[PDB]
Coordinates of C-alpha atoms and ligand atoms in Angstrom, one line a residue:
Chain A
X1 CA 105.7 -45.8 19.9
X2 CA 103.0 -47.9 18.1
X3 CA 103.8 -51.5 17.2
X4 CA 101.0 -53.1 15.1
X5 CA 100.2 -56.7 15.9
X6 CA 99.8 -59.6 13.4
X7 CA 96.8 -59.3 11.1
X8 CA 93.7 -58.1 12.8
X9 CA 91.6 -59.2 15.8
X10 CA 91.7 -58.3 19.4
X11 CA 94.7 -59.0 21.7
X12 CA 94.1 -61.6 24.4
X13 CA 97.7 -61.3 25.8
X14 CA 100.9 -59.4 25.3
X15 CA 104.4 -59.0 26.8
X16 CA 107.1 -56.5 26.1
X17 CA 110.8 -57.5 26.4
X18 CA 113.3 -54.8 27.5
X19 CA 116.1 -56.7 25.8
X20 CA 116.3 -56.6 22.0
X21 CA 113.1 -54.6 22.1
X22 CA 111.3 -58.0 21.8
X23 CA 107.5 -58.5 22.2
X24 CA 106.2 -62.0 23.0
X25 CA 102.6 -61.5 22.2
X26 CA 99.8 -64.1 22.4
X27 CA 97.3 -62.4 20.1
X28 CA 94.6 -65.0 20.0
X29 CA 94.4 -68.8 20.0
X30 CA 97.8 -69.2 21.6
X31 CA 99.3 -67.1 18.8
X32 CA 102.4 -66.5 20.9
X33 CA 104.5 -64.6 18.2
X34 CA 107.9 -63.1 18.9
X35 CA 107.7 -59.5 17.5
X36 CA 110.3 -56.8 17.8
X37 CA 109.1 -53.4 19.2
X38 CA 109.9 -50.0 17.7
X39 CA 111.4 -51.8 14.7
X40 CA 107.9 -53.1 14.4
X41 CA 108.6 -56.4 12.8
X42 CA 108.1 -60.0 13.9
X43 CA 111.2 -62.0 14.9
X44 CA 109.9 -65.6 15.0
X45 CA 106.9 -67.8 15.5
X46 CA 106.6 -69.8 18.7
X47 CA 104.3 -72.9 18.4
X48 CA 103.9 -75.3 21.4
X49 CA 101.2 -74.4 24.1
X50 CA 98.0 -76.4 24.3
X51 CA 94.7 -74.8 25.6
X52 CA 95.6 -71.4 24.1
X53 CA 98.2 -69.8 26.4
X54 CA 97.1 -68.3 29.7
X55 CA 100.2 -66.3 30.3
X56 CA 103.8 -65.5 29.8
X57 CA 106.5 -63.4 31.5
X58 CA 110.2 -62.8 31.1
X59 CA 113.0 -63.5 33.6
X60 CA 114.4 -60.5 35.5
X61 CA 117.6 -61.2 33.6
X62 CA 115.4 -61.2 30.5
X63 CA 117.3 -64.3 29.2
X64 CA 114.2 -66.5 29.6
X65 CA 110.5 -66.5 30.1
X66 CA 107.8 -68.6 31.7
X67 CA 104.7 -69.7 29.7
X68 CA 101.6 -70.4 31.8
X69 CA 98.9 -72.1 29.9
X70 CA 95.3 -73.4 30.1
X71 CA 96.5 -77.0 29.9
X72 CA 98.1 -76.5 33.3
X73 CA 101.6 -76.2 31.8
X74 CA 104.5 -73.9 32.3
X75 CA 107.2 -74.0 29.6
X76 CA 110.6 -72.4 30.2
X77 CA 112.3 -70.9 27.2
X78 CA 115.7 -69.5 26.3
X79 CA 115.6 -66.0 24.7
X80 CA 118.0 -67.0 21.9
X81 CA 115.8 -69.8 20.5
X82 CA 112.7 -67.7 19.7
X83 CA 114.5 -65.3 17.3
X84 CA 115.7 -68.1 15.0
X85 CA 113.1 -69.2 12.5
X86 CA 111.5 -72.6 12.6
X87 CA 109.0 -73.1 9.8
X88 CA 107.8 -76.5 11.1
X89 CA 105.0 -78.1 13.0
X90 CA 102.4 -79.0 10.3
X91 CA 99.0 -77.4 10.4
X92 CA 96.5 -78.9 12.8
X93 CA 93.9 -80.4 10.5
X94 CA 95.2 -82.4 7.5
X95 CA 94.1 -85.3 5.3
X96 CA 96.5 -88.2 4.6
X97 CA 96.0 -90.8 1.8
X98 CA 97.8 -94.2 2.1
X99 CA 98.8 -96.0 -1.1
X100 CA 101.2 -98.7 0.3
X101 CA 104.9 -98.7 1.3
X102 CA 105.1 -94.9 1.6
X103 CA 102.4 -92.8 3.3
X104 CA 101.8 -89.1 2.2
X105 CA 100.3 -86.6 4.7
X106 CA 98.3 -83.6 3.5
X107 CA 99.7 -80.3 4.7
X108 CA 99.0 -76.6 4.8
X109 CA 101.9 -74.3 4.1
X110 CA 103.3 -72.3 7.0
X111 CA 102.8 -69.1 5.0
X112 CA 100.2 -69.8 2.2
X113 CA 98.9 -73.0 0.5
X114 CA 100.6 -76.3 1.1
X115 CA 103.6 -78.7 0.8
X116 CA 103.4 -82.4 0.5
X117 CA 106.2 -84.1 2.4
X118 CA 106.3 -87.9 2.1
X119 CA 107.4 -89.8 5.1
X120 CA 111.0 -91.2 5.2
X121 CA 112.2 -88.5 2.9
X122 CA 112.9 -84.7 2.6
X123 CA 110.9 -84.5 -0.6
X124 CA 108.8 -81.3 -0.1
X125 CA 106.0 -80.8 -2.7
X126 CA 104.9 -77.1 -2.6
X127 CA 102.0 -75.8 -4.5
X128 CA 100.4 -72.3 -5.0
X129 CA 96.9 -71.0 -4.4
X130 CA 95.3 -68.2 -2.5
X131 CA 95.1 -70.2 0.8
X132 CA 93.3 -73.5 0.2
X133 CA 90.4 -74.2 2.6
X134 CA 90.6 -77.9 2.3
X135 CA 92.0 -80.6 0.0
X136 CA 91.3 -84.0 -1.5
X137 CA 93.1 -86.4 -3.9
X138 CA 91.4 -88.1 -6.8
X139 CA 90.6 -91.8 -6.9
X140 CA 93.4 -93.8 -8.7
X141 CA 95.6 -90.8 -8.3
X142 CA 96.3 -88.7 -11.4
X143 CA 94.7 -85.6 -9.9
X144 CA 94.7 -83.3 -6.8
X145 CA 91.9 -81.0 -5.5
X146 CA 91.1 -78.3 -3.1
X147 CA 88.2 -76.2 -1.8
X148 CA 87.9 -72.4 -1.3
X149 CA 86.5 -69.7 1.0
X150 CA 83.8 -69.1 -1.5
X151 CA 83.1 -72.8 -1.6
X152 CA 84.6 -73.1 -5.1
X153 CA 86.5 -76.4 -5.6
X154 CA 89.3 -76.8 -8.1
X155 CA 90.7 -80.1 -9.2
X156 CA 94.2 -79.5 -10.6
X157 CA 95.6 -82.3 -12.8
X158 CA 99.0 -83.8 -11.9
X159 CA 100.1 -84.3 -15.5
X160 CA 99.6 -80.6 -16.3
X161 CA 99.2 -77.6 -14.1
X162 CA 97.4 -75.7 -16.9
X163 CA 94.4 -78.1 -16.7
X164 CA 91.8 -77.6 -14.0
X165 CA 88.1 -77.3 -13.3
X166 CA 86.8 -74.7 -10.8
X167 CA 83.4 -75.0 -9.2
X168 CA 81.6 -72.0 -7.7
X169 CA 79.1 -73.0 -5.1
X170 CA 78.0 -72.8 -1.4
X171 CA 77.2 -69.6 0.5
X172 CA 80.4 -70.1 2.5
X173 CA 83.5 -72.3 2.7
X174 CA 82.8 -75.8 1.5
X175 CA 82.6 -78.5 4.2
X176 CA 83.0 -82.2 3.5
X177 CA 84.4 -83.2 0.1
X178 CA 84.5 -86.7 -1.4
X179 CA 84.9 -88.3 -4.8
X180 CA 83.0 -91.2 -6.4
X181 CA 84.6 -94.6 -7.2
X182 CA 84.8 -93.1 -10.7
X183 CA 87.7 -90.7 -11.2
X184 CA 85.0 -88.2 -12.2
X185 CA 82.3 -86.4 -10.2
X186 CA 83.1 -84.2 -7.2
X187 CA 80.8 -84.3 -4.2
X188 CA 80.6 -81.6 -1.5
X189 CA 78.5 -79.8 1.0
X190 CA 78.4 -76.6 3.1
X191 CA 75.9 -74.1 4.4
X192 CA 73.5 -75.0 1.7
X193 CA 70.7 -77.4 2.7
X194 CA 71.5 -79.3 -0.5
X195 CA 74.4 -81.7 -0.9
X196 CA 76.4 -80.6 -3.9
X197 CA 77.4 -83.2 -6.5
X198 CA 79.5 -81.3 -9.1
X199 CA 81.0 -83.6 -11.8
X200 CA 84.2 -82.0 -13.0
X201 CA 85.2 -81.4 -16.7
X202 CA 81.6 -82.1 -17.6
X203 CA 80.8 -79.4 -15.0
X204 CA 77.6 -81.2 -14.1
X205 CA 75.7 -79.9 -11.0
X206 CA 73.4 -82.5 -9.6
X207 CA 72.0 -81.6 -6.2
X208 CA 70.8 -83.5 -3.2
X209 CA 67.8 -81.5 -2.2
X210 CA 67.5 -82.6 1.5
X211 CA 65.5 -79.5 2.7
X212 CA 67.6 -79.5 5.8
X213 CA 68.8 -76.4 7.6
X214 CA 72.1 -77.8 6.3
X215 CA 73.5 -81.3 5.8
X216 CA 76.2 -81.8 8.4
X217 CA 78.2 -84.5 6.7
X218 CA 78.0 -87.4 4.2
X219 CA 79.9 -90.5 3.2
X220 CA 80.2 -93.1 0.4
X221 CA 78.3 -96.4 0.6
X222 CA 79.4 -99.5 -1.2
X223 CA 76.4 -99.2 -3.5
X224 CA 75.5 -96.2 -5.6
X225 CA 73.9 -95.0 -2.4
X226 CA 75.4 -91.9 -0.7
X227 CA 75.0 -91.9 3.1
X228 CA 74.4 -88.5 4.8
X229 CA 73.2 -86.8 8.0
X230 CA 72.4 -83.2 9.1
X231 CA 71.6 -81.1 12.1
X232 CA 68.1 -82.6 12.3
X233 CA 69.9 -85.9 13.0
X234 CA 68.3 -87.7 10.0
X235 CA 70.4 -90.5 8.7
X236 CA 69.6 -90.1 5.0
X237 CA 70.6 -92.7 2.4
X238 CA 70.9 -90.9 -0.9
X239 CA 72.7 -91.9 -4.1
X240 CA 76.1 -91.0 -5.6
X241 CA 76.3 -88.6 -8.6
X242 CA 72.5 -88.6 -9.0
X243 CA 70.6 -87.1 -6.1
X244 CA 68.0 -89.5 -4.8
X245 CA 67.0 -90.1 -1.2
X246 CA 66.3 -93.9 -1.5
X247 CA 66.3 -94.8 2.3
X248 CA 65.7 -92.2 5.0
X249 CA 66.4 -92.6 8.7
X250 CA 65.5 -90.4 11.7
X251 CA 67.8 -91.9 14.3
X252 CA 68.1 -88.7 16.3
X253 CA 65.9 -85.7 17.0
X254 CA 69.2 -84.0 17.8
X255 CA 72.2 -83.9 15.4
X256 CA 74.0 -87.0 14.5
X257 CA 77.0 -86.7 16.7
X258 CA 79.4 -89.2 15.1
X259 CA 78.1 -92.0 12.8
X260 CA 80.4 -94.8 11.6
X261 CA 79.8 -97.3 8.8
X262 CA 81.4 -100.8 9.0
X263 CA 82.8 -101.2 5.4
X264 CA 82.1 -104.9 4.7
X265 CA 79.3 -105.2 2.1
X266 CA 76.6 -102.8 3.3
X267 CA 75.4 -105.2 5.9
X268 CA 75.5 -102.7 8.8
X269 CA 75.8 -99.1 9.9
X270 CA 75.3 -97.3 13.2
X271 CA 75.3 -94.0 14.9
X272 CA 75.1 -92.5 18.4
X273 CA 74.3 -88.9 19.2
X274 CA 73.9 -88.2 23.0
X275 CA 70.7 -90.3 23.0
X276 CA 70.8 -93.9 21.8
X277 CA 73.4 -96.0 19.9
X278 CA 71.2 -97.0 17.0
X279 CA 72.3 -99.6 14.4
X280 CA 70.7 -100.8 11.1
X281 CA 71.3 -102.9 8.0
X282 CA 69.7 -100.3 5.7
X283 CA 67.0 -102.8 4.7
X284 CA 64.6 -101.3 7.2
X285 CA 63.6 -97.6 7.5
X286 CA 64.3 -97.9 11.2
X287 CA 67.4 -99.2 12.9
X288 CA 67.6 -103.0 13.6
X289 CA 68.5 -102.1 17.2
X290 CA 68.5 -99.0 19.4
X291 CA 71.2 -99.5 22.0
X292 CA 70.4 -97.9 25.4
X293 CA 73.1 -99.1 27.7
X294 CA 74.4 -95.7 28.5
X295 CA 72.3 -93.2 30.6
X296 CA 75.1 -90.6 30.0
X297 CA 74.4 -91.2 26.3
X298 CA 77.1 -92.5 23.9
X299 CA 78.9 -89.7 21.9
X300 CA 80.5 -91.7 19.1
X301 CA 80.9 -95.1 17.6
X302 CA 83.1 -97.1 15.2
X303 CA 82.8 -100.5 13.5
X304 CA 85.2 -103.5 13.7
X305 CA 87.7 -104.1 10.9
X306 CA 85.5 -106.6 9.1
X307 CA 84.6 -108.4 12.4
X308 CA 81.6 -108.2 14.7
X309 CA 82.8 -105.6 17.2
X310 CA 81.3 -102.1 17.5
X311 CA 82.8 -99.5 19.8
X312 CA 80.6 -96.9 21.4
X313 CA 82.6 -93.9 22.6
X314 CA 81.6 -91.8 25.6
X315 CA 82.3 -88.0 26.2
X316 CA 84.9 -88.9 28.9
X317 CA 86.7 -91.2 26.4
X318 CA 85.0 -94.3 27.8
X319 CA 84.4 -97.0 25.2
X320 CA 81.7 -99.6 25.3
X321 CA 82.2 -102.5 22.8
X322 CA 79.0 -104.0 21.4
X323 CA 78.7 -107.2 19.3
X324 CA 77.2 -106.6 15.9
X325 CA 74.1 -108.6 16.6
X326 CA 71.3 -106.3 17.8
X327 CA 73.1 -105.9 21.2
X328 CA 74.0 -107.5 24.4
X329 CA 75.6 -106.4 27.7
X330 CA 79.2 -107.0 26.5
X331 CA 81.9 -106.1 29.0
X332 CA 82.6 -102.4 28.5
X333 CA 86.0 -101.7 27.0
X334 CA 86.1 -99.2 29.8
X335 CA 89.4 -97.7 28.5
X336 CA 89.9 -94.9 31.0
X337 CA 89.0 -95.2 34.7
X338 CA 91.3 -93.1 36.9
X339 CA 92.8 -89.8 35.7
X340 CA 91.0 -86.6 36.5
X341 CA 91.0 -83.2 34.8
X342 CA 94.8 -82.7 34.8
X343 CA 95.7 -82.9 31.1
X344 CA 95.1 -82.8 27.2
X345 CA 92.6 -85.6 27.2
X346 CA 89.1 -84.2 26.5
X347 CA 87.1 -85.6 23.7
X348 CA 86.5 -89.0 22.4
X349 CA 87.6 -88.3 18.8
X350 CA 88.2 -91.7 17.2
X351 CA 88.7 -95.4 17.6
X352 CA 91.3 -97.4 15.6
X353 CA 90.7 -101.1 15.8
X354 CA 93.6 -103.5 15.2
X355 CA 93.4 -105.8 12.2
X356 CA 93.4 -108.7 14.6
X357 CA 90.4 -106.9 16.2
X358 CA 91.9 -107.8 19.6
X359 CA 93.0 -104.2 20.2
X360 CA 91.4 -100.8 20.1
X361 CA 93.6 -97.7 19.6
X362 CA 91.8 -95.1 21.6
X363 CA 92.8 -91.5 20.9
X364 CA 91.7 -88.7 23.2
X365 CA 94.2 -87.0 25.4
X366 CA 96.7 -89.5 24.0
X367 CA 96.8 -92.9 22.3
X368 CA 96.2 -96.0 24.3
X369 CA 95.8 -99.5 22.9
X370 CA 93.0 -100.8 25.1
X371 CA 92.6 -104.6 24.9
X372 CA 89.1 -105.4 23.6
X373 CA 86.8 -106.5 26.5
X374 CA 88.3 -106.1 30.0
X375 CA 91.7 -104.5 30.6
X376 CA 94.2 -103.0 28.2
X377 CA 96.9 -104.2 25.8
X378 CA 99.5 -101.7 24.6
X379 CA 98.1 -98.6 26.4
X380 CA 101.5 -96.9 26.8
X381 CA 102.5 -94.1 24.4
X382 CA 101.4 -90.6 25.5
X383 CA 101.3 -88.0 22.8
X384 CA 103.3 -84.7 22.7
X385 CA 100.5 -82.6 21.2
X386 CA 97.5 -84.4 22.6
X387 CA 94.0 -83.9 21.1
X388 CA 94.3 -86.0 18.0
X389 CA 91.2 -85.7 15.8
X390 CA 91.9 -88.1 13.0
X391 CA 92.7 -91.7 12.3
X392 CA 94.7 -93.1 9.4
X393 CA 95.5 -96.8 9.0
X394 CA 97.6 -98.5 6.4
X395 CA 95.9 -101.4 4.6
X396 CA 98.5 -103.5 6.4
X397 CA 97.6 -101.6 9.5
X398 CA 101.3 -101.5 10.4
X399 CA 101.6 -97.7 10.6
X400 CA 99.4 -95.0 11.9
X401 CA 100.8 -91.5 12.4
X402 CA 98.8 -88.9 14.4
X403 CA 99.2 -85.1 14.4
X404 CA 97.4 -83.7 17.4
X405 CA 97.1 -80.2 18.7
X406 CA 99.6 -79.1 16.1
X407 CA 102.3 -80.7 18.2
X408 CA 103.5 -82.2 14.9
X409 CA 102.8 -85.3 12.9
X410 CA 104.1 -88.5 14.6
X411 CA 104.7 -91.8 12.6
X412 CA 104.7 -95.3 14.2
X413 CA 106.4 -98.3 12.7
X414 CA 106.4 -101.3 15.0
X415 CA 109.4 -103.6 14.6
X416 CA 110.1 -107.3 15.3
Chain B
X1 CA 66.4 -70.4 40.2
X2 CA 66.6 -66.9 41.5
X3 CA 66.5 -64.8 38.3
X4 CA 67.6 -61.7 40.2
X5 CA 70.8 -63.4 41.5
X6 CA 71.2 -65.0 38.0
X7 CA 71.2 -61.5 36.5
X8 CA 73.9 -60.5 39.0
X9 CA 76.0 -63.5 38.0
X10 CA 75.5 -62.7 34.3
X11 CA 76.5 -59.1 34.8
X12 CA 79.6 -60.1 36.9
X13 CA 80.8 -63.1 34.9
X14 CA 79.3 -63.2 31.4
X15 CA 78.5 -59.6 30.3
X16 CA 82.1 -58.7 29.5
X17 CA 82.0 -61.2 26.6
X18 CA 78.3 -61.7 25.8
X19 CA 75.0 -59.9 25.3
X20 CA 71.5 -61.5 25.8
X21 CA 69.3 -58.9 24.2
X22 CA 67.8 -59.3 20.8
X23 CA 70.0 -57.7 18.2
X24 CA 72.7 -57.1 20.9
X25 CA 76.1 -57.0 19.3
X26 CA 78.6 -59.8 19.2
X27 CA 81.4 -59.0 21.7
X28 CA 84.2 -61.5 22.3
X29 CA 81.5 -64.1 22.5
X30 CA 78.3 -64.6 20.5
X31 CA 75.0 -63.0 21.4
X32 CA 73.0 -65.4 23.5
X33 CA 69.5 -64.3 22.5
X34 CA 67.5 -67.4 21.4
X35 CA 70.1 -69.7 23.0
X36 CA 67.6 -72.3 24.5
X37 CA 66.6 -75.0 22.1
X38 CA 69.3 -74.0 19.7
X39 CA 72.2 -76.3 18.6
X40 CA 75.8 -75.3 19.4
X41 CA 77.6 -73.0 17.1
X42 CA 74.6 -71.4 15.3
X43 CA 74.5 -67.7 16.1
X44 CA 74.7 -66.3 12.5
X45 CA 77.4 -63.7 12.3
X46 CA 79.7 -65.3 14.9
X47 CA 82.8 -67.2 13.9
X48 CA 83.1 -70.1 16.3
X49 CA 85.9 -72.6 16.8
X50 CA 85.4 -75.9 15.0
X51 CA 85.0 -77.5 18.4
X52 CA 82.1 -75.2 19.4
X53 CA 80.8 -75.4 15.9
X54 CA 80.7 -79.2 15.8
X55 CA 79.9 -80.1 19.5
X56 CA 76.5 -81.2 18.2
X57 CA 74.4 -80.6 21.3
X58 CA 71.2 -78.6 21.9
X59 CA 71.5 -75.8 24.5
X60 CA 69.0 -76.3 27.4
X61 CA 69.2 -76.5 31.1
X62 CA 70.8 -80.0 31.3
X63 CA 73.5 -79.1 28.8
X64 CA 74.1 -75.6 30.2
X65 CA 74.4 -77.1 33.8
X66 CA 77.2 -79.3 32.6
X67 CA 78.9 -76.7 30.3
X68 CA 78.9 -74.0 32.9
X69 CA 80.5 -76.2 35.5
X70 CA 83.5 -76.5 33.2
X71 CA 83.4 -75.2 29.6
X72 CA 86.8 -76.6 28.5
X73 CA 85.9 -80.1 29.6
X74 CA 82.5 -80.0 27.8
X75 CA 83.9 -78.4 24.6
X76 CA 87.7 -79.0 24.5
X77 CA 89.4 -76.4 22.4
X78 CA 86.7 -73.8 23.0
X79 CA 88.2 -70.2 22.8
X80 CA 85.8 -69.1 25.6
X81 CA 87.9 -68.3 28.7
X82 CA 85.8 -69.3 31.8
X83 CA 86.9 -71.5 34.7
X84 CA 83.4 -72.6 35.5
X85 CA 80.7 -72.0 38.2
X86 CA 81.4 -74.7 40.8
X87 CA 78.3 -74.1 43.0
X88 CA 75.1 -75.7 41.6
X89 CA 72.8 -73.1 43.1
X90 CA 74.6 -70.2 41.3
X91 CA 74.5 -72.3 38.1
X92 CA 70.7 -72.8 38.5
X93 CA 70.3 -69.1 39.2
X94 CA 72.3 -68.0 36.1
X95 CA 70.6 -70.6 33.9
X96 CA 67.1 -69.4 35.2
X97 CA 68.1 -65.8 34.4
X98 CA 69.4 -66.7 30.9
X99 CA 66.2 -68.7 30.2
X100 CA 64.2 -65.5 30.9
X101 CA 66.4 -62.9 29.3
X102 CA 67.4 -64.8 26.1
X103 CA 63.8 -65.1 25.1
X104 CA 62.5 -61.7 26.2
Ligands
LIG501 C1 78.8 -67.5 32.9 C2 79.2 -66.6 31.9 C3 79.1 -67.0 30.5 C4 78.1 -67.6 29.9 C5 76.7 -68.0 30.4 C6 78.5 -67.8 28.5 C7 77.7 -68.4 27.5 C8 78.2 -68.9 26.4 C9 77.6 -70.0 25.6 C10 76.3 -70.7 25.9 C11 78.5 -70.2 24.6 C12 78.3 -71.3 23.5 C13 77.0 -71.0 22.8 C14 77.1 -71.4 21.4 O1 77.6 -72.6 21.1 O2 76.6 -70.7 20.4 C15 79.6 -69.4 24.7 C16 80.7 -69.3 23.8 C17 81.6 -68.3 24.0 N1 81.9 -67.5 25.0 FE1 80.8 -67.4 26.6 N2 79.8 -67.4 28.4 C18 80.2 -66.9 29.5 C19 81.5 -66.3 29.8 C20 82.4 -66.0 28.9 C21 83.6 -65.3 29.1 C22 84.1 -64.8 30.4 C23 84.2 -65.1 27.8 C24 85.4 -64.4 27.5 C25 86.1 -63.9 28.5 C26 83.3 -65.7 26.8 C27 83.5 -65.7 25.5 C28 82.9 -66.7 24.7 C29 83.4 -67.1 23.4 C30 84.6 -66.5 22.7 C31 82.6 -68.1 22.9 C32 82.8 -68.8 21.6 C33 83.3 -70.2 21.8 C34 84.0 -70.7 20.6 O3 83.7 -70.2 19.5 O4 84.9 -71.6 20.6 N3 82.2 -66.2 27.5 N4 79.4 -68.6 25.8

C-alpha cells in the first residue's frame, strides 16, 4: 500500500484505523485530517485542537479516539462524526467592517477564496479567485479588494464583476493594505523597503522610499500624513497618496512591537516595544514622554476611546493604564494575577476599551472585562478557541465578535 | 557557559531540527547561523509562522534565556516543538555554545 497525504510537507503525526480503513493523520499545524487508507481518499476534516496536536490514538473498539494536544487537552471523539462533512469554522485571520445594524465578517473559503456571511442571516456571499492572500473593502463601499501571493492587488467593483484593476508589486505576498479617505488610491507594503501607494484606475505608483530593510506596518492619520514603522523601530510620519516623510521618530532601536494611535484629532500617539512606552503629539521630533514604569518592558499599548486613558500591555497579559498627560504612577489595571501556564492564554494581542471608558476588554487566552484602575468589571466569559488576535467594535460599541484560534467567530449582543 | 556541554546539548536537543553552520540547510527549523543580534523570523528561505515572524524581538542572550525555558510561552503559536530547558546552567551552556558556533 501507499496512501499519499494531503498536499506536500513532512508528516508530524499519523494514525491508521483498522476499522473503515481510516487514517486520522495530523500532517502539520494540527492538520488532523480523516483520510481513508487503500482507497486513498480523505473522508472528512477535523478542526478543533489548539497548540497543534501532540497526539491521537483510537479505542481498542475503534469506535473512538483520544486527542492529546499541546494545550494540555484530550478530546474524545466518536468514529461516526469524523466521516460526515462539516465545512465550517471560519479561517483564523479575517477582517470585519462594521457599517451599523448588521456586521459583516471577512472570510476565507474552506476550499478556495472566500464567502461573506452576514451575521443574523444565512446569506453566504461566495467569490472566485486563485486563493486570495488578504482582503480589504473600499471606503464608502461600492468596491471590494484583495491581495495576492505575488503582491498583486485587485480591486473588484461591486456594480460589475468585469471591472477591476490589478497591481503587480512587492517581491512576495503583500502585507498591510489600507485605503485613503478618498475612494481612490490603494496603499500597501511588503518585503520592499518602500511603502507602496498604488492609486487604482489611474494606476498611479507613488512610493514611500523609507530605505528600511522593510517597513513593518503603517496606518492612516487624520491629516494627509501616513503613519508607519519598520524593523528599525522608527516611527515615521509620512503622507497619504504622495510619499513624503514629514515627521520622523526613532522611538525604538528595536522593532516597533505594537503602536496604537488615539483617533481624536491628531493630538497624541504612542508605542511600546520591549523597551519604553513612548508617547508624542507629533509636534515634536521626539516623544512628549518616555514611559519607563516597567522593567519587564511593555509589549503593546492602546488609546482610550476619546478619553485620557492609555493601556500598556505586558507579555503576560498584564495591563498598565497610563493617563494621557506625560505619565504618572496610575494604579496598574493589573488584569491577570493568578493563573499559571495551564491554558490558551499567551500573548497580549489587543485591548478594547468600553465607550464609557470604565472598562477594558482584555483579550489574550480569553476575553475579560477588567475594570479600569483596580479590580475587574465583567471579567467572565472564557472563549472556546482562545488566542484572539483582532478587535472589532461597533460605533455604538454594543457588539464585538471574536474569532480566536479558528475556534469559530463568536458574536456578543448584550441585552437589557 | 561551558561551550563543550552546550555543544552536547545542541547535538542532543536541537540538531534534529536545526543547523548552526554557514550555508547549513534548513531542516524542520531554520538555520541558526547569524542568529545573535538578528530579529525574529528573518532567516531568508525559511517559512515561519506569523507568530515567530512577528514576535518583534532581537535574539541575544537575554531573549534566548527566556525563549529556551519555554518556547510556546515566549512565542505562542510557534510550530517549534520543544518543552524547554528548565535548568539555567544548561541554558547558559547551550547559549554560550550557540554564540560561538553561529558566528564561526
Ligand atoms: C534547544 C534546542 C533548540 C534551539 C536552540 C532552537 C533554536 C531555535 C530558534 C532560536 C528559533 C527561532 C529563531 C528565529 O526566529 O528565526 C527556532 C525556531 C524553530 N525551531 Fe527550533 N530550536 C531548538 C529545538 C527545536 C526542535 C526540537 C524543533 C523540532 C522538533 C525545532 C524546530 C523549529 C521550528 C520549526 C522553528 C520555526 C518556528 C516557527 O516558524 O514558528 N527546534 N529554533
